[PDB]
Amino acid sequence: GYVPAVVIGTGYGAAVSALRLGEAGVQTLMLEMGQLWNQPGPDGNIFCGMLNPDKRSSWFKNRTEAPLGSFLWLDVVNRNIDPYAGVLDRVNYDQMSVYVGRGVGGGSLVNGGMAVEPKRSYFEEILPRVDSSEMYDRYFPRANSMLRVNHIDTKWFEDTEWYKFARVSREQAGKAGLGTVFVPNVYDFGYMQREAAGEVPKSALATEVIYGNNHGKQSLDKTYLAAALGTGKVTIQTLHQVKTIRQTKDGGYALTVEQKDTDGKLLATKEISCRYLFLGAGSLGSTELLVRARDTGTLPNLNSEVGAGWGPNGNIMTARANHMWNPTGAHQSSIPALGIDAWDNSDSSVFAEIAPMPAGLETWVSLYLAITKNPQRGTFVYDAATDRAKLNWTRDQNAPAVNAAKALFDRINKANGTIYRYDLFGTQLKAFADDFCYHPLGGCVLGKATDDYGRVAGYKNLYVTDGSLIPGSVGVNPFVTITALAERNVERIIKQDV
Numbered sequence: 249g250y251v252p253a254v255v256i257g258t259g260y261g262a263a264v265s266a267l268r269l270g271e272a273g274v275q276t277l278m279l280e281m282g283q284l285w286n287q288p289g290p291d292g293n294i295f296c297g298m299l300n301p302d303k304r305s306s307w308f309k310n311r312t313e314a315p316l317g318s319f320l321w322l323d324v325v326n327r328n329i330d331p332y333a334g335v336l337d338r339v340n341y342d343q344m345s346v347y348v349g350r351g352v353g354g355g356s357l358v359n360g361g362m363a364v365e366p367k368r369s370y371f372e373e374i375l376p377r378v379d380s381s382e383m384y385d386r387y388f389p390r391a392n393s394m395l396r397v398n399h400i401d402t403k404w405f406e407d408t409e410w411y412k413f414a415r416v417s418r419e420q421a422g423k424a425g426l427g428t429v430f431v432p433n434v435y436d437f438g439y440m441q442r443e444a445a446g447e448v449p450k451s452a453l454a455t456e457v458i459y460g461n462n463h464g465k466q467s468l469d470k471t472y473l474a475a476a477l478g479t480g481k482v483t484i485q486t487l488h489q490v491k492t493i494r495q496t497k498d499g500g501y502a503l504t505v506e507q508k509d510t511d512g513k514l515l516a517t518k519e520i521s522c523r524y525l526f527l528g529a530g531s532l533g534s535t536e537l538l539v540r541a542r543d544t545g546t547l548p549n550l551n552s553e554v555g556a557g558w559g560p561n562g563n564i565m566t567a568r569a570n571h572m573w574n575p576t577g578a579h580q581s582s583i584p585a586l587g588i589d590a591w592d593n594s595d596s597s598v599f600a601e602i603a604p605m606p607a608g609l610e611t612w613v614s615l616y617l618a619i620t621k622n623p624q625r626g627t628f629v630y631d632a633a634t635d636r637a638k639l640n641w642t643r644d645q646n647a648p649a650v651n652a653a654k655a656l657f658d659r660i661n662k663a664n665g666t667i668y669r670y671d672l673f674g675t676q677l678k679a680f681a682d683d684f685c686y687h688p689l690g691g692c693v694l695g696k697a698t699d700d701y702g703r704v705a706g707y708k709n710l711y712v713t714d715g716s717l718i719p720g721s722v723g724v725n726p727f728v729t730i731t732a733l734a735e736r737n738v739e740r741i742i743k744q745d746v
């Protein structure tokens with residue numbers, strides 16, 4: 249049927265949008281292709297941990313996979329599984345694998361919780377048409393509060409075995425003249441202290457994050473989406489995937505929406521129409537919907553920028569082998585707390601999170617997820633034969649990102665007399681993982697495919713809200729930027745359009 253506003257997806261852009269729509273009195277339906285994650289499973293927990301993956305770990309795969317960096321220790325726990333509506337989706341393109349969350353809350357279910365504001369001078373570089381004072385004065389603070397960002401206690405951090413891995417890389421980096429920074433998070437650090445004291449059920453301290461956290465992590469279902477539901481004007485329908493979007497003859501938008509069960513069986517195909525349509529399906533999902541709509545003729549006035557301008561936030565993973573006298577610990581909190589900030593907006597910039605590893609025994613490995621400044625961009629290109637967007641990104645397009653990450657970590661290795669690991673990513677000697685992405689950005693870039701508030705060019709009352717808006721790079725973990733931009737956008741759209 250008809251509903252005034254429809255929001256596609258339930259990640260950061262979607263959740264912000266729906267809350268503010270509901271507070272404005274606009275009856276809003278959110279359509280989420282994944283599950284509402286609230287049913288205890290066979291182990292009594294909602295989510296599987298990284299040491300006990302099962303079908304809940306994976307969106308329609310037939311075998312579990314080790315977390316990137318940890319195959320050498322965690323392939324032993326991998327098992328065949330039934331394809332199921334699990335929480336983490338590795339989306340494979342030709343030369344890039346993009347990891348995304350599937351469920352009510354999107355990537356907030358599976359992410360590391362790291363809540364980082366971009367450097368203002370970099371924000372101003374990447375989005376020169378956006379008023380940066382309103383962002384820093386109003387919208388970043390608003391996002392920080394609503395997301396429930398918090399800060400680790402420094403004495404606890406210094407003392408606990410669960411962060412030895414972070415302290416080891418801090419000391420090594422310091423020998424190279426390189427500084428670290430604490431990383432704010434939406435995981436409750438007070439709860440985490442109580443986990444270490446044996447006072448509450450463990451989650452971060454029980455090798456959970458990338459398939460969800462059973463405790464501690466304030467994902468969007470607890471924050472923005474709970475508040476949106478609280479308005480009395482928002483509902484969420486799950487296992488509902490939007491397939492097509494058209495402008496109806498009488499105005500507004502009509503959607504074809506497939507309802508499936510958790511085995512992927514098609515239960516129904518529904519038509520849902522609306523006055524206001526907000527896309528929050530992610531960099532991948534929103535862009536795919538719009539490239540499909542353009543190239544199959546259902547939104548024929550979409551512009552040529554739809555699909556363009558994608559980048560992986562310069563994501564590169566690498567690892568160093570510590571000296572035997574610098575063990576990183578068998579017990580590593582699954583939530584990172586420290587990063588190395590070597591980001592000065594130049595082409596050598598690196599912001600790298602000191603990543604835990606889940607093996608649970610001493611490996612001497614330090615793992616890092618680097619964020620770099622690489623101008624290369626890909627394009628999503630509709631394939632009408634398979635009805636899919638294809639991302640045309642080739643691995644050599646990540647050479648600038650690898651080069652920047654390598655130059656930084658070479659400094660650390662030189663200062664400490666250490667070498668890289670070469671065996672963490674596959675059998676072939678490869679120190680830098682250069683064909684994954686946790687932070688997809690772009691495809692429907694703000695001011696290119698849309699106006700400066702995410703209004704899709706060529707259409708009225710059609711909005712994009714999410715990581716597809718960002719021009720390929722933000723220099724930090726992206727969800728705070730997505731959230732703050734979405735706060736800015738929906739406030740203006742409600743005032744001017746609704």
Ligand SMILES: Cc1cc2nc3c(=O)[nH]c(=O)nc-3n(C[C@H](O)[C@H](O)[C@H](O)COP(=O)(O)OP(=O)(O)OC[C@H]3O[C@@H](n4c[nH+]c5c(N)ncnc54)[C@H](O)[C@@H]3O)c2cc1C
Pocket residue numbers: 256257258259260261262279280281282347348349350351352353354355356358359360361362363364458488489490491528529530531533534537686687688714715716724725726727728730
């Ligand atoms: C392993 C991992 C670690 C990460 N760690 C961090 C971190 O610590 N800090 C950080 O800042 N970022 C992190 N990220 C990235 C962050 O989660 C991501 O940038 C945001 O979740 C993107 O938000 P969007 O709203 O764009 O989008 P997203 O959160 O991906 O949500 C899109 C939602 O739309 C749903 N959907 C898609 N298509 C459709 C459709 N056609 N119909 C219906 N529903 C649909 C989809 O299932 C999902 O629930 C991480 C991500 C991963 C995968």
